[PDB]
């Protein structure tokens, strides 16, 4: 009747409480970073996606996400930042962009 393998739910909720708390910081900071690229302020979002970048690739050491998509959640961010900084954007160098 009883089984000692009920522990796996008590790692499932205990680690779901961590992963659910970590996955919001990718797209929340990413959409908040891509909004400021439309606003015009570049260095603010360039300060944002260093911490968001740290919360992508530093979160890529556990088991939340470390795949080719772990590179693409950052690649869509730094991809979609750089286009709209040309129509009167004055692209300076913060931390994210390499050029």
Partner RNA sequence: UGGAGAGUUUGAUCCUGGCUCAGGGUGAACGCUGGCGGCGUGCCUAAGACAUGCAAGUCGUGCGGGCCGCGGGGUUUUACUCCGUGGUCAGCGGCGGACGGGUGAGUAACGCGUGGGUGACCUACCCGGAAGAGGGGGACAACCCGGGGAAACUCGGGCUAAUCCCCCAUGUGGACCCGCCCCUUGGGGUGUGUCCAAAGGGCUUUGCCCGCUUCCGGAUGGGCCCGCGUCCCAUCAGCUAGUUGGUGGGGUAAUGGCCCACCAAGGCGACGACGGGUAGCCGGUCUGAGAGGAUGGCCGGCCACAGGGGCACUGAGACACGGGCCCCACUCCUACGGGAGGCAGCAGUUAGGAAUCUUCCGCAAUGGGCGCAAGCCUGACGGAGCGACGCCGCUUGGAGGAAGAAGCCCUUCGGGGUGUAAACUCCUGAACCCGGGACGAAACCCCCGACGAGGGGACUGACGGUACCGGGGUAAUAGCGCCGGCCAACUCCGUGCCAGCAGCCGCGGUAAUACGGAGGGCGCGAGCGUUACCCGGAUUCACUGGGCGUAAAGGGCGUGUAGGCGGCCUGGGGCGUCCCAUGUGAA
Contact set with RNA (CB under 7 A): 1, 3-12, 14-16, 18-19, 27, 50, 53-55, 57-69, 71-76, 78-80, 82, 93-99
Identify what 16 binds: Mg ion, RNA, none; CB under 5 to 8 Å per kind: RNA
**58 alpha-carbon distance from chain centroid:** 10
| Residue from 94, 93, 57, 51 nearest 74 by CA | 57
4 binds Mg ion (CB under 5 A): yes
- Residue 53 in contact with residue 96, Cβ under 8 Å? yes
Interacting positions 14-73 with Mg ion (CB under 5 A): none
């Amino acid at each position: 009747r009883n089984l000692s393998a009920l522990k796996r739910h008590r790692q499932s909720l205990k680690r779901r409480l961590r992963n659910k708390a970590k996955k919001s910081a990718i797209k929340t900071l990413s959409k908040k970073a891509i909004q400021l690229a439309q606003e015009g302020k570049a260095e603010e979002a360039l300060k944002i996606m260093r911490k968001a970048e740290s919360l992508i690739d530093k979160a890529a050491k556990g088991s939340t996400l470390h795949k080719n998509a772990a590179a693409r959640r950052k690649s869509r961010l730094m991809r979609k930042v750089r286009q709209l900084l040309e129509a009167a954007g004055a692209p300076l160098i913060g931390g994210g962009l390499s050029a």
